Amino acid sequence: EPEWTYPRLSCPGSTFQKALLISPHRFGETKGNSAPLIIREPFIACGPNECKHFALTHYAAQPGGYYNGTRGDRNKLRHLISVKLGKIPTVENSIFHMAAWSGSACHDGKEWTYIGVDGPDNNALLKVKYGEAYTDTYHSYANKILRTQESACNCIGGNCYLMITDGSASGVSECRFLKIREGRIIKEIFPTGRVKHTEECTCGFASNKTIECACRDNSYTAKRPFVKLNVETDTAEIRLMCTDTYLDTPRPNDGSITGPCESNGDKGSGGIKGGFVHQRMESKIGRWYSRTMSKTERMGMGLYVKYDGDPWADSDALAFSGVMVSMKEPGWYSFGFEIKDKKCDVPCIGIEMVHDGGKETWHSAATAIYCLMGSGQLLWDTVTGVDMAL
Amino acid sequence: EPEWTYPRLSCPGSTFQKALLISPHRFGETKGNSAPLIIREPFIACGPNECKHFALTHYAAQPGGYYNGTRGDRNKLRHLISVKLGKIPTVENSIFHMAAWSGSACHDGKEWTYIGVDGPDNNALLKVKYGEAYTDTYHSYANKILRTQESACNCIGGNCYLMITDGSASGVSECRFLKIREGRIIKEIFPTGRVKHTEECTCGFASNKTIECACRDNSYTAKRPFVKLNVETDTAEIRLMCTDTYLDTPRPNDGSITGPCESNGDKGSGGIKGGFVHQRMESKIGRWYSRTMSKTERMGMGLYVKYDGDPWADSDALAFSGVMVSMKEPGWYSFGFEIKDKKCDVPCIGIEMVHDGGKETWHSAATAIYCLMGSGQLLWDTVTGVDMAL
Amino acid sequence: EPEWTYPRLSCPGSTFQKALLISPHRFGETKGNSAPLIIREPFIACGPNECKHFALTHYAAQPGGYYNGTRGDRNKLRHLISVKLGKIPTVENSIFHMAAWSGSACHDGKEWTYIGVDGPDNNALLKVKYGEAYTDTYHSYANKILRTQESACNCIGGNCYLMITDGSASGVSECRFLKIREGRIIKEIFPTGRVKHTEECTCGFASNKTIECACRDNSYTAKRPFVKLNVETDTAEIRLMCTDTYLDTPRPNDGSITGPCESNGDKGSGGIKGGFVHQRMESKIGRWYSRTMSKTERMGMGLYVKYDGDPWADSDALAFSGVMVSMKEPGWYSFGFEIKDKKCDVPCIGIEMVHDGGKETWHSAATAIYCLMGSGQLLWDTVTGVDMAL
Amino acid sequence: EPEWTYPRLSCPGSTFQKALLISPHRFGETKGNSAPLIIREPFIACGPNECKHFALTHYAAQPGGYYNGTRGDRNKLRHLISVKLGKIPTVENSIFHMAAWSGSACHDGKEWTYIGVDGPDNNALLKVKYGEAYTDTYHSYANKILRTQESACNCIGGNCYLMITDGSASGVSECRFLKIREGRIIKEIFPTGRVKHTEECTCGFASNKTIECACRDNSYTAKRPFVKLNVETDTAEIRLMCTDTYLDTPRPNDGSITGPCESNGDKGSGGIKGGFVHQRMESKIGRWYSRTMSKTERMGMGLYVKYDGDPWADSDALAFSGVMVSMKEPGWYSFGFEIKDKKCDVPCIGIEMVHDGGKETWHSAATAIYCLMGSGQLLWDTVTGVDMAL
Ligand SMILES: *[C@@H]1O[C@H](CO)[C@@H](O[C@@H]2O[C@H](CO)[C@@H](O[C@@H]3O[C@H](CO)[C@@H](O)[C@H](O)[C@@H]3O)[C@H](O)[C@H]2NC(C)=O)[C@H](O)[C@H]1NC(C)=O
Ligand SMILES: *[C@@H]1O[C@H](CO)[C@@H](O[C@@H]2O[C@H](CO)[C@@H](O[C@@H]3O[C@H](CO)[C@@H](O)[C@H](O)[C@@H]3O)[C@H](O)[C@H]2NC(C)=O)[C@H](O)[C@H]1NC(C)=O
Ligand SMILES: *[C@@H]1O[C@H](CO)[C@@H](O[C@@H]2O[C@H](CO)[C@@H](O)[C@H](O)[C@H]2NC(C)=O)[C@H](O)[C@H]1NC(C)=O
Ligand SMILES: *[C@@H]1O[C@H](CO)[C@@H](O[C@@H]2O[C@H](CO)[C@@H](O)[C@H](O)[C@H]2NC(C)=O)[C@H](O)[C@H]1NC(C)=O
Ligand SMILES: *[C@@H]1O[C@H](CO)[C@@H](O[C@@H]2O[C@H](CO)[C@@H](O)[C@H](O)[C@H]2NC(C)=O)[C@H](O)[C@H]1NC(C)=O
Ligand SMILES: *[C@@H]1O[C@H](CO)[C@@H](O[C@@H]2O[C@H](CO)[C@@H](O)[C@H](O)[C@H]2NC(C)=O)[C@H](O)[C@H]1NC(C)=O
Ligand SMILES: *[C@H]1O[C@H](CO)[C@@H](O)[C@H](O)[C@H]1NC(C)=O
Ligand SMILES: *[C@H]1O[C@H](CO)[C@@H](O)[C@H](O)[C@H]1NC(C)=O
Ligand SMILES: [Ca+2]
Ligand SMILES: [Ca+2]
Ligand SMILES: [Ca+2]
Ligand SMILES: [Ca+2]
């Protein structure tokens, strides 16, 4: 019988490398015979036996006749879908889990938990599914687009932890954490500290005691809010990342935000979901992050790392590790996840590479994956290979 | 080793919410590369591990060259098909179970039973399949279109109960129930009471002792015949639902049928299969029902509920619970089903949303699913998103 | 662990009924988006858990550009393929087992055995595959198109029995039987009696001791050669069926062949593979057969039955049971098979319904299935629904 | 519970025969509705339960709009993919394992190991994946296109051995072997002897003590370098095959390289990966090889065998065993593999049949399979059946 899973030590390694590209629109030509789904906000979550590649589809394929509206975020057609990682998400390969315009998912060792938010902007609804069964919901508390992570939730000993938020995209958005067990919400956690705006948290285990998240402040700062959640006391605290290497887009020059660690600085309005994943060693913790190559545009994606220290207090620049996507290619959302090897966990970062041709045509994304493997330096970047005119 | 299943107490909850849309014709454009099957009369049935989405296909895809005849009900090509719930029912995803122009299916805890009626109108034949094996048949007893539920049958302790009927759609159609065990009919059950017209029953467990069904009278009344079947004595009785909230379509204004509960009233000719599902609690029983928003057309779908009482005797209006499908969208057949969570059952209602462009084009359907989940009020409605011109 | 299978008593029943149509070319329109494979000689074989639908493909799809040659029988491209019964055999659903222009297959309780003959006409080669592994071959002994059953072989206690033949289609073709165990040929059986021409045997168990086959004489007679094979002594004898109801096509009027049971009569040249399946009861054996409705053309298919007696000696007409395919629809090869229910076997007959438009267009087939189920009379016929111009 | 696998004695047999053709571009017509992937360098590897058909795709389908570049070898889009052997490798059937422009894979009895090399020419990177997890890397040691076998690696007792090489295609390329256990490289093995150029080794077990490989020298000779790797001491030595039957393409006339076994001779520049597989018997060893029918072009494929002796010392011609592909058809890379029967191993040779129409059109391949089976002589050749204009 399957047991609850826990975070384990990470597999040996000191550099990330290019692992896999999932580029469904390489097969979406009018000259072709395929039906890749139109998606955005992909993420990956893994259990003991398989990884699933999730996304939010507009319920439309390329080529097709429903391109109009695919540049939008929320409508009554959007669904959370998945395929086994490594499969191309087409109309036929994919499975439709639930209606959702914001999502998350995770495996607790026994079963998959799926999370989807839908409903009207002023009264949206988070829905929880455990395996095939719809099991619970959570209601909007600020009546301003309740929404969730767009990346994997995190389970330990059967308790799955999930960030949600609600509030104006250009004002206050005070997040909360839900503790969910076998598909049912058993506790709400209200974070303390710097809470004025936190959304799209990318979260993972720093240890058996602590979940950490690197999130997006869409109104006030280009520093990322950083959550430390103690899963033993079920309490969370949030402070801005102090590093000079500001991880949001847009952002000012590195190090140019004057004042104490808590200072907001300029170019704070706007944002992007960012990649973040832990490398747990015997007596060290590696924190790996990604940010766009452009300071203002969703172009390129670079990988950064820092071992140990307090991210709330260290102003040190992160160490640049490598270009995962060049400045000539799209770099949109990024997320962390861990693959389960036989005895250890493999930290990875995925990158959403959006095909953006404006509102007059289809709008979708490829997914690039980089994982910790071996030593040395990160060697190759990723391109989608897609010509949007075909 | 698998054991026989029994109905269990329902999962906690007090409102339904939008769960999932299966809209295969979102991919049926001539500009596209997909092959959704042309279907009608979808329904869902679940076993301990998976849910299956069934329908009757005309053995034709969209886009395709066999649209002519897809608006008809019975022919030599119609088949019962299924996919795993969440998969799009295409030519390649689907499995063809048996020739059938009327259908049902259910899981007894060990194996699937599939039910399909075909043959000439004056001498049709119900066929039973257990897993891969064709195991039994039952003959027409009135020689006027023997037909069955178009929704899940119900199994308890290995015994599966199924409504069948036979007789004029505009006259007498006295139903019977079959008791089926491991694919073989072991008993016929002859209901007493108000028996002159009962078809397309939507059935479920009120408890371990009782199956209840809400059915269609296509001839005499807009009230639904309501079956109570005692599975301990294998006997059944039928009376009209007394509620002022008449569930058939067409129907007169609510409460306008004067006289005692048994009064047939006006606008009784015509009808539609209706959603019905139980919420079994320790000391009370919830009965959830759906009906079109239009009193005369197959447009829209609203949800209603009433706890406890006797549906044969209570004239009280059902409580309106919300709009699942607005009156601007098609609302055709609806059906109940239950998903098996680990320790409890989740009641759901499914809605057939027919794409009707007349007899000169294709004729098929989407399926929308609403399930009991959380508390509060039902929040969002469903659209198919399909433009039939594409 | 799986055990060797043996023939069991047949499930209760006294009539066949229409079960299932597999008509892949309903989705082969140029207006469509599917890829049904171009096939002929379908047959079905079942194991304890699933039935497989086999055919010989020309390695070409409809619509496609390789129609030229699909009316032929033997070339270097033909392969034995299968899908799970109930799936449409398309390019993607199908699995390609081996190069073959004549085939057979069967399950021994533990594993599938696949049989395929290919090679040049004057030195063809039978190949045996057990699961994934190629395990043995048998060589041509008459150097005149070695060929096999085009229907399921038959396994008992791990020993699988298979008819092969070799010789002129318009002269002598003396068949042999191979005994194969775990993919390896362990014995050749040389039949005695009337052996001058036997091919395309349709075989099944009359009991644990005896396999019987109804075969095709393509040169001398419209009576079918009938094999009795004793699997306990591994000996076989062949005599012509004596019944006045001649099962081959073409054929003279029933009963018109004068003289003793062994008389050949007129219209013997030409032939067709015929359906034959056993209904094994406690103290009776039902023999079910099929033949075309037309005496000279591959049009229509009717079902016949006789209980008990010696088919070598009884001149009695078989009892007509029902029209499975009308005289207006194609009726080509037919075959027997048995589905394994939990405790008993279900006898079935499948019918190849060839789409024949001549050599200037594609040439393929649908498969119709009829099985023993319930009592009464056979109620409905099967049509392919295909318009070859689309 | 699974155990480590070891090479076993080969199944009985004395000749190869045509087994199976995988020709996905038979379905790639513009008139069709399929999406075979554009691939090259296919190979097959088998575990205890299934065989997988691997290839390197250009991440493009036929028909499609990305043909430009498919005649090249290395780019940022190439991926290692697989399907179950017998399935057509299409967009939807295939699974994408990892970014790779050179590949290998093998099963150790418990799990699949996948090998993919990508990165820039001057600093390429071998990546190892065990099941779903990326587990290790190995760096370029000569900074000139690190590359691997393009055929199955070989596992014994959980230890998997793999050839890699690095260096100029027209100069020195000294190979090494990696010993890999559960996805992690545990030893590097440095061969001695004739080491100046070895690439694309086709390797297999001669016994539990010895792996042998037949490789390609793209620079110096038409003789194949022949590796003997002792897995008990983890050491290797390489010498040229002495046989007069030179296996490379191009090559001079058989026997025309004068002088001792080590003589390089003429027409050594250029080369092709060659098929090689062992037939292990109680007291003898069969070595089966394939080479093109043309001495200078990649046309045709013939099979050769020799029992016993020392391939380093014996100048004797190999025995010609038959034409697998005629000189009218393409014969490109070939490879060995073994299928696991229940108690013994079946040696096979696979042949890449490239569809080459130049750089102005698509460039892909079919795969033909020949396996040891039965006795006598090899009887039929393979054609792809593909018209590139369609
Ligand atoms: C309808 O009748 C069935 C059969 O009696 C009821 O199912 C039974 O439910 C009880 C309690 O709900 C189960 O007892 C449990 O046994 C497990 C061990 O298997 C134990 O760990 C639990 O603490 C509990 O004692 C019983 O197993 C179960 N039987 C079967 C065959 O499933 C069902 O509850 C009834 N439905 C109603 C009342 O709505
Ligand atoms: C390479 O070495 C391996 C490991 O020693 C050899 O595999 C072993 O082969 C022997 C006989 O072929 C197997 O013995 C058998 O054991 C079973 C019970 O498991 C018994 O029923 C049989 O009668 C027989 O005694 C042994 O199990 C097997 N070991 C493993 C781990 O597979 C292999 O034969 C060698 N390859 C050669 C010599 O080519
Ligand atoms: C978190 O705690 C779990 C629970 O103890 C740890 O999992 C155990 O790890 C040890 C070896 O480190 C194994 O021997 C046990 O079998 C594991 N138990 C379970 C239930 O998996 C886990 O290693 C801890 N995570 C760390 C230390 O990073
Ligand atoms: C759609 O199908 C119907 C019924 O098959 C067709 O109507 C028949 O047309 C034929 C003409 O060949 C007449 O002989 C029959 O009497 C008609 N039957 C009925 C019931 O009207 C109709 O033609 C088809 N439509 C198209 C566009 O082909
Ligand atoms: C043929 O022989 C087999 C072998 O005995 C019979 O299978 C047995 O059937 C009995 C009941 O009839 C069971 O109790 C045994 O468990 C079966 N054994 C196996 C190995 O399956 C089979 O019934 C015989 N076929 C007939 C009588 O038609
Ligand atoms: C096929 O691809 C090649 C390489 O990408 C194309 O060749 C390039 O064409 C551009 C024109 O925009 C030149 O600037 C480059 O110098 C060319 N590169 C090389 C290596 O020649 C070629 O045009 C493509 N073919 C087609 C038909 O589009
Ligand atoms: C979608 O775009 C079209 C223009 O192409 C516009 O007319 C239409 O109103 C848009 N849809 C909605 C829902 O506004
Ligand atoms: C196939 O038919 C064409 C005519 O459409 C003919 O020219 C060709 O020769 C035929 N193929 C063979 C192999 O003869
Ligand atoms: Ca910001
Ligand atoms: Ca009515
Ligand atoms: Ca004849
Ligand atoms: Ca060379």
Author numbering:
A (entry chain B), B (entry chain A), C (entry chain B), D (entry chain A): 76 to 465
Authors' own words:
The neuraminidase inhibitors (NAIs) oseltamivir and zanamivir are the antiviral agents available in France to treat influenza A or B virus infections. The NA active site includes catalytic residues (R118, D151, R152, R224, E276, R292, R371, and Y406; N2 numbering) that interact directly with the sialic acid substrate and framework residues (E119, R156, W178, S179, D/N198, I222, E227, H274, E277, N294, and E425; N2 numbering) that stabilize the active site. NAs are divided into 3 phylogenic groups: influenza B viruses, group 1 (N1, N4, N5, and N8), and group 2 (N2, N3, N6, N7, and N9) from influenza A viruses. I221 (B NA numbering), I222 (N2 numbering), and I223 (N1 numbering) amino acids are highly conserved framework residues in NAs of influenza viruses.
We used X-ray crystallography to understand the structural basis of resistance to oseltamivir conferred by NA carrying the I221L substitution.
